[PDB]
Structures are given as structure tokens and as C-alpha cells.
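Please complete every field before forwarding. Incomplete forms are returned to the sender.

SECTION A: IDENTIFIERS
Entry label: holo-1722
Bound molecule: magnesium ion
Molecule representation: SMILES string

SECTION B: INPUTS
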Amino acid sequence: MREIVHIQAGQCGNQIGAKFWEVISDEHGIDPTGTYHGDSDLQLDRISVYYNEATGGKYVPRAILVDLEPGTMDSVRSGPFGQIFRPDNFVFGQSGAGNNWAKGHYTEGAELVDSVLDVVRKEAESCDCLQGFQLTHSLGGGTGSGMGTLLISKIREEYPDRIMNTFSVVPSPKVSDTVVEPYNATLSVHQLVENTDETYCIDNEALYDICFRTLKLTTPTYGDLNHLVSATMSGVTTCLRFPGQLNADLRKLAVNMVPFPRLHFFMPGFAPLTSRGSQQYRALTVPELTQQVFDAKNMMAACDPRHGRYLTVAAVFRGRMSMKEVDEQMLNVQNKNSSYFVEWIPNNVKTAVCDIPPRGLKMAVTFIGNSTAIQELFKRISEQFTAMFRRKAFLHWYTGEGMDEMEFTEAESNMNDLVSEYQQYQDATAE
Amino acid sequence: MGLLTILKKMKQKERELRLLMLGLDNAGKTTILKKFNGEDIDTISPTLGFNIKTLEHRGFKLNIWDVGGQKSLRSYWRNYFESTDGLIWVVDSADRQRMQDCQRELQSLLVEERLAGATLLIFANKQDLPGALSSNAIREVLELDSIRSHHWCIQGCSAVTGENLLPGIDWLLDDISSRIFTAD
Amino acid sequence: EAFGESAETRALLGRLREVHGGGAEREVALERFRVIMDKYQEQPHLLDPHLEWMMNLLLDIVQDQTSPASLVHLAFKFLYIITKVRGYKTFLRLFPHEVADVEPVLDLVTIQNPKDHEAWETRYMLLLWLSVTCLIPFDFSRLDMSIMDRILQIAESYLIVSDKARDAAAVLVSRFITRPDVKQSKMAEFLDWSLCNLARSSFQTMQGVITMDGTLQALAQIFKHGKREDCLPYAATVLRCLDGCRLPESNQTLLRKLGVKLVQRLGLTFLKPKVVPEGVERVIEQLLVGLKDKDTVVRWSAAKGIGRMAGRLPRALADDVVGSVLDCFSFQETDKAWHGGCLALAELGRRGLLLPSRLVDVVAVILKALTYDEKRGACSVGTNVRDAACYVCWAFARAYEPQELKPFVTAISSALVIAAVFDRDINCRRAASAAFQENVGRQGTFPHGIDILTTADYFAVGNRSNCFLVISVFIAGFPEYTQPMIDHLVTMKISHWDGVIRELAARALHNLAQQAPEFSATQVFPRLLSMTLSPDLHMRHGSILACAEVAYALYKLAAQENRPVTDHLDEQAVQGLKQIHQQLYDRQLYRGLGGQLMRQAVCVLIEKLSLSKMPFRGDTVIDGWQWLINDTLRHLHLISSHSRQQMKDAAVSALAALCSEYYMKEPGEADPAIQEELITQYLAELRNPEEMTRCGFSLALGALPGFLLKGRLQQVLTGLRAVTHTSPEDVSFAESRRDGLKAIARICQTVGVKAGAPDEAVCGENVSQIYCALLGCMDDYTTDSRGDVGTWVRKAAMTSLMDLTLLLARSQPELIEAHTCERIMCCVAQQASEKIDRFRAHAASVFLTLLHFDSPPIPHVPHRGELEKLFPRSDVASVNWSAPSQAFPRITQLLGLPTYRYHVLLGLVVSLGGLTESTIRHSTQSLFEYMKGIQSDPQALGSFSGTLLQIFEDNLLNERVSVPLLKTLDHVLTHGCFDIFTTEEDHPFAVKLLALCKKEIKNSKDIQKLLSGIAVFCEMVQFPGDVRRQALLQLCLLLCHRFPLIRKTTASQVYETLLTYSDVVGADVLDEVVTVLSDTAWDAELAVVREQRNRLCDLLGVPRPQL
Ligand SMILES: Nc1nc2c(ncn2[C@@H]2O[C@H](COP(=O)(O)OP(=O)(O)OP(=O)(O)O)[C@@H](O)[C@H]2O)c(=O)[nH]1
Ligand SMILES: Nc1nc2c(ncn2[C@@H]2O[C@H](COP(=O)(O)OP(=O)(O)OP(=O)(O)O)[C@@H](O)[C@H]2O)c(=O)[nH]1
Ligand SMILES: [Mg+2]
Ligand SMILES: [Mg+2]
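SECTION C: PREDICTED COMPLEX
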């Protein structure tokens, strides 16, 4: 029985975590009251991985929500599923970090970081054997950007033998017009490289473009992006909550998908693409899903998987497809002589097959690969980070709190070295 | 909680204050409140409740809660003595027939446990009138020397004319800011 | 400063009545309103001037009886957002408080549904509004189910709501039951209702705990905002009911916090508010234990209760409380107990309760709290007990007086400044600085209280690195904060767990020793000489660093009076510097994880000792240091990669300092016995199969001084060049070749220039051989399993070609030849146009540094005027070469020159056809901008095509430049660049291009190379004549390949070309070709595809192929 502690910080982080928990609860068959009412025995053989069995046969979540601002806290407390989260697992202040990374990591977010450690430690004491912590936040802001880094740096010192996985949400100028976002993203990535084993990047520009073109929505709001983020999160954590032949734990998955220490950013995806409201319209097959998992349109990041090498590939199928039918399809797409052969679907790919399908869909698929194209996500922020650094714009706010140009240049050098290593590995011999 | 947050929270309470204003009927307390904030006097009506007013002055934020003077409301003044730093009491000098109707209530407001600590300030209004008693006579008719557990300072002022309206609040603020600590 | 979004706010609300039906518009407005309001979360006092009208535009909507429920909910959402931003306490004073606003509000709240989770913002705010209407000085009976009963029922039904509305029910009942007419009517009823809920509910369910929390909050608010004499009779029953529940044992933090908050309030009701039932004896018993809780929120709440209770009780009990709280600092407690005790002491001192009798005790504990850091694992704990000590010290300014604090000021002021500088947490430093400022402003009896604040203000204790080399010296300048400040650093930080604390402390001591040399040489150095024998690993590193730093500082100080270094340090201390190496060599401490740290420390120690000119020359200590350096430069692969560069750059520096200090016989010469062996061993170590051995030995041999290279320079140069040469065995040896060039560059920079001396320095006799080795490593393009590692070998190959070219320019510029200079310039230009970003930036920087160098100007600069005009001085620091957008537009202009055309184009082809997307997108746009200017001139286009064909011919059968070039040709042809060559039949250029393409597509197997070939073959159909027909034939050969994907791609490309160019096929036969290329499965068996291929050939006039 391997348990996982889920933590949420920042407005966007909490909004994503609430939706993800609601999705994985509706898929497992858990009414919003707390009891169980599903119709499948497979929805309980691994429920202990994210739910504590309290008295009375109830399943208490393990989501530790923290937020300096008392906004999203009250909304999640009175949500469709707000009554599930323990009430002393909510840790908040009054004034946030004011879009400054040096506020939610040094002067403000380090004022509740001690209450966070007490809560995450009180939650882990009941577990029989902890596997690894988890965090869901956005690189944009101060309580998501600085608080997450502070907690990741503080927990690694007391639990070095635990896996550290995050779900960073890179912002984009299209979604937010804030100008102090490049610095918060750079400083967050600087800490998310030396104290993180895995990081699932969910760029906001990709979801914005998807909602603008694919879904054809009028004004894509935050709900449309949160729905896709929660869908991708539920599709990624399919092996850690359901049985199957590929019993890849968290540590095993991180070791098999992350050969290098610094390189650990993935490009998660999910298909088919849907929206809120209606969903039932067309039933997809295994060939169509495989053809669409590997399309740059189904990806949640502004990167072209085809343009770049393939470090490690993995896919998770959900529905009445059999690992034998999947192997037949995964052994004819890595062959040129084979018809309908693809050049971007690589070899030695990891593949899974689930029984319980997602909500509102009979068949789906999730992609969790790591391509060098992700470098584009790091360069877009580099340029915006240099043009504003030469003029020293909005730097007094950082220098007054305690930060200095030393950390800025260190983060810049780290990002440059990472981009250089990515570009160097992109040109490697296949055999 | 750290020391910085404690200091930031204490500064908010030190800068913000609350002043409970009371007085018998037609004592001229709302005619003095409007003048302190700069408003019209020819549009005041007998208030039958309580009025809250927030205004900045010398950096401080004066939260003045003024209550009427009708007897029917005198039995509901127990809902204003919380977090009260100053207690203003208006007295009509020309009402020398009800100076014992305001002395009987003044001897019951200082003994309160909640008001035990706030600075008292007596405002003798209606001084420009012909039969208006001076501050010395009011200090003796109300028996102000008997008070000892409160820092009182009877002062003669006016509303329609406006005389010594600023010093009255200045002295109260100076006396409230002199305390290093307070009860809770 | 002020609110500036109000101009947009009044318009938003104006649209509230229109976006009430739509969902997208409502969400956009709500999100917009929230992003407009969250900007002033730090400045809540800036929205007060606008709290008047902003409210009138909201409550006025719900007041209208002719509005739907959606609009009411949307308005309540904005109201709740405004309350969250500003605050309910300061915002409900604006809500209507008339007797005619009560029955309206009540019916409004009663029209709600607690099950509706979407409208939770309407139920949470409405209740609050009711509280306002409960402030009227009127009786509920005058308004007239009664109103009091309805309010009580609503409160009882909401006090068990799992949503936020429960909180709204706390402030409501707190004002309704505490009324004159309702504290004699509903108070007893709500009291029997709370006792039943507390006795029945349990903390094992989610609903039982919710009701318990609600009841506890309601009781705590009632006892807080309620009369003391009214809630006194019912003070024992509630206490007994709370004690019978066993809250401390429950596993709930909020429940325990509320229980403590209720217990402290109940205790405050027994005592009279002045400037003691047996029940009180229990209240205290429930508060002290609260300080020894696991959570900090419980201790923070218990501290306030204890502070409030000690002030309403006598002076005998007040002293007993302090005596009992002092017991928490015993030798059998954790850090949480100390934190709680410090919080309680601060809360007690803030009110002025501690007597001078407890000065000898309290002061005897705070000194231990400011420096609390008890290692509790990999990291240490105590940052909580330290932040509390700051607040405790801040309270002494208001409690004790100067006369009562003078005996302990000498120790308090020093401790404050010690904890306000070298602290690891910025919060602790800021708290200590604030406490010091408060003590100086009130007491004013601190030594130099004003001078210490001006230099260490709130905006000065921010940068930790600055506090260790700026504020430390300023504080040590006075004789009151020198010896204790040094002792603290010696006995705390230099023995810390983190390594940044053992490096910063050493650097701070380096400067502190300048103001107190006697104390650091006679009292501190002996303590650092004995600390090295400590079994602790973090203690030995710190002691070594301190011994090195203090030694360097003493040497620098003695250098002023041209006095020897032995004046400050005695010979006893000198013998320690010799035995430190023997002690480490005997115990064999150079193993395990700490071996690398010990080696790094000893390297810095030896470097600082050799840089001070110690009396160690001619002793076995020098031999031991040399052996240790050799062993460290001998075993490098065993060290982790996260700290290999540091050990590589420190060992070489230490060896150079030793070889440039001790290893000398006379001025201008050295001991031949050591010169005949060191160089020999190094040359026998530069041929070591292990790549890490050479990587460490090359730099060590190159870092030698100039007097130690006299006569043996040719041998060293030959040995270094032998490593730079590639061989079948050394294929993936890039790090070794990099160090080989780095050492050569270092030797060249050290020896300088001297004519008539090839064995002593560089001259015209060996400059050609040196330049040949530097120009040969630039062509290294190895592609190992890791990737393009050869780039590394090029990096050091660029700087080596820069610093060298300048060296001659500063002595004998005539040695630089014209051909070599032109080759170096062309190679740098090629290297400054590579798809890579980090390497291209360095290449452009080197190019600019070499071009702008005019002191003196460097000879043999091709097109020097054009290069200066295309790359002015202002475009050096402002242009970001790392960004392709801010690099390619300026690099593509070099194609105009003749010399910068072949190499520049070869370098840009890699970026115009690589794998990255943004780089290609930028390079194509930059190339099109230049081609647009040379599109009409036929000579320029012909020269460009000739250069491209020459580059193609040069890199033939090469998968590094062939694929990028073929990919770039596709875009060049699709854009329409070679439009002038299409008006002539049988163009030699298009013929040779097709011939080379046929060569490159000969037996092509990989699909990546086949795609570019197919694209080029389909983009070449534009050229009429024999190139049109022959090219078409190739397409046919690709329509029946060995894979169906190739056939499908070829068919798609042919269909696209048929639609692009219409003059290629006649209109009479175009219909048949279009119909045959549509209803034909090109991914089927070849038996059926051959018929379609023959049919298409018969129509396109292409001769029937033959197997
Ligand atoms: N996808 C998505 N992005 C969001 C959401 N909320 C905010 N963001 C983005 O995240 C950034 C803002 O960070 P927040 O999470 O709002 O901030 P915070 O972490 O609470 O920090 P403070 O502003 O300091 O209080 C911007 O780039 C927003 O576009 C959300 O619900 N979904
Ligand atoms: N002549 C004169 N009349 C004054 C003066 N100050 C106030 N008044 C009048 O005294 C009367 C009572 O003052 P108000 O403020 O209106 O009433 P109140 O004192 O607030 O009492 P409540 O109505 O019980 O709340 C009004 O007619 C005022 O205009 C003054 O200095 N001179
Ligand atoms: Mg926020
Ligand atoms: Mg009035």
C-alpha cells in the first residue's frame, strides 16, 4: 500500500487540484458526500493510494490546500466536493505575494511554510509507507511560484528518500497581461531543476490555442483550461490508481523515463479533445487514438514532438482495448514496410491498457513523452527575460526584499546550460 | 507568526481608533459631528439609532460611532462599548434643568467594565446662546473632580459657530497615543 | 498609492444587468473583477474612498424586487469578493442598519437553498448583512413566527453548514444573543443547544466535527462579545462540557485551537478586568500544556490566552505563571516547547507583567534561544524558537526600564547584533533588527545604538552575502562587538551543517581579522588549529577554511609594512600548518564522501599558504603537498560530476602557486632536480588511457609559471599537441582535447613573446605549428551516443584563438600571417552562424572582441570597413546573440561580401535545415530578406547558386550537412528565389543540382533523408527543358518504392506540384492525371500500384521504367 501526498498551492494550483480530484472521484464512483457507490470491484483495490480509510468506511482525501489569499480556499470549501477535504488541511494568510517571487518565497510565503510542513507531516504520519510527495501550482504569480519552490526545498531536506513530482503550469501573455511573469517563471524553473525529479509542463498558450481553434469557443475562460488540465492529470495517473500488467510505481517510472538528472520535463497530452457540457458525439477506435496521441494538436504544450529527438516514450490507453491489440498496433508503426507507418512514433515506447474508462467517454488515451522540442518552452521565456533584464525594469522590488542580481544571473546561466544540453542531445545518433 | 507580521498587525490597530459619541436628546452631537467632517447643518434630522463615520485626520482613521439621546434608546447603548478607545459626551449648556439628567447617566457610563480604560471627553456645546453656562459652572454642576479612574477634560465648544473643535480631538488623540499597552 | 481601475469598475457593474443570463460573459466579468481587485491585497486601505458608491451599485440591485435570481447571485459574488479584498469587519459598517432593513434581509436569506453550492456566495454574505440589522437599538417585538425565533433557527441550521456560511453564523449569533432583549430570551436556549451538540457529536465523522467547530466558534464569539456578568453563571457548565470531550487527545488542530480560545475566554470571565475561583486553577492547567503542542497555531493561540490571563489575576499567581512557563526550557523538551515558552514570555512582557526578580532567569534563557539550531537530521531545526526570541527581546523595551536592563544590556545588545547579521533566515534578521531599533528608540542605552541602525536598517539586512562582508566589519569596527562576534562565528557557523555557512563565515573572518589581528593571531588561530583534530567532518572543513583565510589576511596585513608573515603567527602555530597534512594522511581521511571535501579544503589551504610566502620551502611538507596534488589530479573519475570542475580548477591553481613560490633555486631559474622529474612524470601522465587523467594533467602542466618552462617549452608543447590529435582509440575524447587546448593557451599567455628563444617563449619559429593545432581542432564534428559533444572541443578552440591573437598584437603583431588571420576570421564567422544558441553567442562575442580590438589594431582583417559598419560598437551589448531573432537578421547580411559567403553559408545551412523550429523559422526569414535584394541582379544569384553547389559537392555522402542543405533547398525553391533561371531551357545549374541530388538519393534507405529528396525532386519540376522530364522520371521511381509511406508521400507531392505549376502538364491530360492520383490507394500491394504507375507514366509522357 503505497500512499501519495497531494499538495496544492496558489489560485491556479488549487483550481486545477479541485477539478482533478473531482474527476478522479467521479471516475472511481464516489458521491460528493464521502461514501462509496460505484459498480466495480477494481475501484477499491488501489483507493488507498490517494484516500485514507477513516472510521465508518469513509474515504478522506489527502489534498493539502495552501493559499496566502483567502479566495480559492472558501470556494473549494463550498464546492461540489469541498466537504471531502479535511478542514485542518487548509492553510492560508490574508495578503499574498503581490506577483513577486521574493515575497512568496522569503517574506510572506515563508510565514506559512512552517504551518505547511506541520500539516504535510501530520498527514504523512498516518500513512503506513509514503512513496513521494506531489505539488500542483503555476510558474506565474508568487504564492504558486515562490511557495512551491520553498516547500520543495524544505521537504527535500527532511525526506531525501521521497520522490518529488510537480505539475508546473507555464503562463502565457495571451492568458495574462502581467509583466512580472518572466522573472517569476525563471526563478521557479531555477529551483525546479536542482530539486525535482519530474515536472509535467502544461503550457497555457497551448490550451488557449486549442480552445480558440479546436473547440471553437468564443472567449476561452479559465474553466476550459482547467477541464483539460484535470483530464490530462487523470489520464497520467492511471497506472498509480488501477491494476494492470505494467505495474510501474512512481520511482520506477521516474527511473525508466528520466535517464538524466537535470532533464526531466515532459510533454503530457490526452485524446480525444472535448469541452464542457455535451461530449458524446463520435466514438473513436484504437487506430484513430494512436494517430491522434502523437499529433502536436493533442499536446498541452506549444512544441512539435516530431521536430526533435525522443528520449523516452510512453502511452496509457483507457477502455475496452486489449494489450494484445495494442501491441499489434505498436509493432506495425515502428516498421517502414508496414502501411500507415509514422516517423514521429518512436521505438521502445512504454504502453499500458486500462479497464475503467474516463467520464463521459468510452475510449481515450494519454501520452507522457519527453521530446527535445520542450526546449522551445524554455527559450520563449529566455528572450522575455533578457530584454527586461538589460534595462533593470522592476528590479528594485526584488532587490528591496533581499534578492540580488546574483540569483538572476545564476538562473539565467542554468537555463542557458539546460537549453545547450537539450540542443546538443537533439542531434544524437540513433544507432 | 513572525515579529514582522505582529508589528504590521499592531500598526493597523494603533493607527485606527474608535470614538463612541453619546449625549442627551437635542444636545447638539450630530451638529458637531457634521462640522468636524465638513457637511451641511441645515439638513440634520433627529436620528433614531446610530451613525458610523470613517475619516482620515493627522494620519489616523477616526471611526466615530454616534448614538442618539432618546430615552428609548438609552437601554441599547450596551452594543457600542466594545473596542472603544474614546468616549465623547455632549452636554447642552442651556439645558441647565437637565444637567442632573446627564450627571445620572455619566455616573453609570464610567463604571462600565468595557469602558474602563477609554479616554473621556466632555463637549459643552451651545455656548454662543445668551443663557449658556460657562465651562467652570458645568465642571462643578456635573461633579467632574470626583472622577479619578478616567482622564477627563471638559472643554467649551460650539457647532454652528465652531470653536475649539480641533483641539478637542487633538488632545484625545494625544492621550490615546500615550498609552504603551492596552487590555484585551 | 491610489485605486486607478475605478474608471473601468463603474462600467463593469453597469453591464451586470446584461451579462446575468450568459455564462461566458458572466465568467469573463467575474474573472475580470477579481483580477482588478486582487492588485490591492497589500493595500486594502486604498479602496476605502470608493467603498461608498461601489456598494450602492451592488446592494441596490438585490433590493429591487423586479430582478431574477441570477442577477442577485452575480451581485452577491461581487459583494463577497469586495468583502474578501477589504474585509467584513470594515465593510459591514457600510451595510444598511435600519429597523426596515431587517425583515427584508431575513426573507432574502430564507429564499435561499443550502444545497445550492453554486450560490454559496449568496448565503455566506446575506447572513453577515443580518448581523448589521441586529445592531439597531430597537426591540424585535416592536417589529411584529417571531423574528427572534426565526433568527435563532437560522443560526442553528447554519452553524452546522460545511460551507463557509458557518463562519457567517459565528458573528451573527455573537450579536443576536448578546442583546438585552435576546440575552434573557434566546441565550439559555442556544446554551442547552450547544451543550447537547457537544455531548452528542464526536470527532470521528466529518459532520460531527463540523458541528463541534461551529459550536466552539459560536461560544468563543459569544463569550468574547458578551457581558462578563451575564455569561458568568454559565461559565462552569461549558467548561465541564468542554473538559469531558477530551479535545487535546483528538487528532484535530482546529478543534484544539477553538477549545483553547474558549478556555482562555472562560478564564477571563472569572477574573474582573483590573489595571479567583478554583475553576481558574483548571483554566491555567489547560493553557500551559498548549505551549507543548505539535502545531504552531495552537501555541500561538495559547500564548495570547496566557498573556491575557496573567493580567487579570494577582501578582502572586502572575509570578507563578511565569515560573511554570520557565519550566518549558528544561533539558527534557523539544524545540516546540521552547517556541511556546518564548511566545508566552513575549505575550507576558508586551503587557508589562514580568518583574525584575525574573531578570536573572529570563535573560539566562533568551541567550540560548537566539542561537538555537539543534540538528534533527540532514537539516537542523530551531528557526521557530529564534523568531520568537526576537519578539521576546522586542518586548523588553516596553516591560523593564533602563535601570533594570543596564546590567544585561552589554549581553543583549551584542546578542541582537550577532543574530541580526550571521542569521541564515532573512525573517530572523529582520525581526532582530526591528527589536534592536525598538530597544534603541525606547531605552536608548545601547552602545552606538544610532550608528548601528543607520548601517543595518530594514533595507540593509536583506542580502546575506552583503551582511558577511559589509555589516560585519562595520560592527567589528567598535571594541564592543569584536571578540564575542568572532567567537560566535568560530564556535557556531564554521561548524554548521550547510557548506555555504562554512564558506561565508570564513570570508567574513578574513575581513574581521583586519580589525583585530592580535586577537585573531593569539586567541582564535590556536582554537582553529585544534579544531582540525575534531572527528566531525563539517568541523574540519570549517577549521581549514578559517586557518587559510586568517593566514591570507595576516600575510596581506604584513605586506603593508613590508614585514614577514611570522611576526603575527608564532612557530608553535607554524608547526600546525606542517602537521595538518600528516594528520590527514595518517588517518586516511581522503576516502568516502568527505574525501572530496577534505581534498578541496587542503587545496585552498595550500594555495593560501603558498600565496603568503611561508617558511615551508625545502621541507617534507612541500613533498607531501605535491604528492597530494598529484593523487588528486591522478584520481578524478572517482569524484562526482557535480563538483569536478571545482577540484580541477583549484588543484591546478594550488600547483601553480606552489610551483611559482617554493619550487625555485634563484631568480629567473628553478631547482633542476624538480624540473627534470615533474615535467617527465606529467608527459608520462598525458598518455593515460583514462580521459579524466589527461583532463586534469593538461591544465596542471599548463598552469606552470614561465621560469619553470625555460628550455622545456618545446617538449610541453609537443606533449600537449599529441593529445589534441584524434586517433582511432581517442574518438569520444572531447574533454581531454578541450583541456589540451586550454593548457596551450595558458602557456602561450604566460610565456608571452620573445624573439630568438623558441624554448623559452613563443616566437616566429613555432607560431605556425601552434596555429596549425588550433585550426585543426575546429573541424572536429564528432557525434557520439551522448550527442554533438564536439561542440565542447570547439569552445576552448575559439577562446584559445582569441587570447592568443591578442597576445601577439600586444608585442609582435607582424608574426600574425594574412592567410592564418583570414582563416581564423572565416572560421569564427562560420561558428557564429550555428543553430546552437549558447555557442553562437560566445562565437559572436569573440568575433566582436577581435574586430573591435584597436589598441593596437589587428592586421589581416578581411573587409574591415564593411564588418565595422555591419557590426557597430553600439550593437555589441544591446544585441542578444543567444536569441535567433536578434542574431540571424544581422548575420545574414555577411553574405554580401565575397570572403564571407562560402563559410557563412555552410554554417547557416545547418540552422536553415536542422531540427529546432524557431531557429529555422528565424533563419529562413533572415535569408529571404537578403535574397530579396539580390533577386533581380543575375550575377549575385548565379554566384549564390555556384557557392551552394560547391558546398553541396564538398559535403557529399555526409549526413551532417546533406540533410540540412536538402531541407533548405526545398524552402528556397518553394519561396521562388530561382525565378530567372526558369526562362531558359537546359540550365547547367539545375542540371548539376539534379545530378547531385540523384547521387545523394542513391539507394537512400532512411525515411528522413527520402522525404527531403522527394521534396526537392517535386520542387525541381519548375525548371523546364530536359530537367523537367528527367526529374519527373525520378518521381516515378519513388511511386513504387519499398515502403507504402514513401509511395503515399510521393503521390501527395506530385498532386501538390500538379496544382502549383499548371504549365507542366497540358489541360487535355491534366484531368486524367488528377483522377488517377485521387482514387488510388498508394499504400497497397505493389502488384496493383505498378499498373497505376504505368498508367501515369503513359499520360505524363515519361518513358516506361525498367527493373
Ligand atoms: N490555466 C490556468 N492558469 C491560471 C489560473 N489562475 C491563474 N492562472 C495563471 O497563473 C498566473 C497567475 O498566478 P496565480 O495562480 O493566480 O497566483 P498565486 O499563485 O495565487 O500568487 P499571487 O498572485 O502572488 O497571489 C497567470 O499567468 C494566470 O494566467 C487558472 O485557474 N488556470
Ligand atoms: N443655537 C445652537 N443650536 C445648536 C448648536 N449645536 C446644535 N444645536 C441644535 O441643537 C439641536 C440638537 O442637535 P442635533 O445634533 O440635531 O441632535 P442630537 O444632539 O444629535 O440628538 P439626537 O437627535 O437625540 O440624536 C438641533 O436643533 C441643532 O441644530 C449650537 O451651537 N447652537
Ligand atoms: Mg492569488
Ligand atoms: Mg443625532
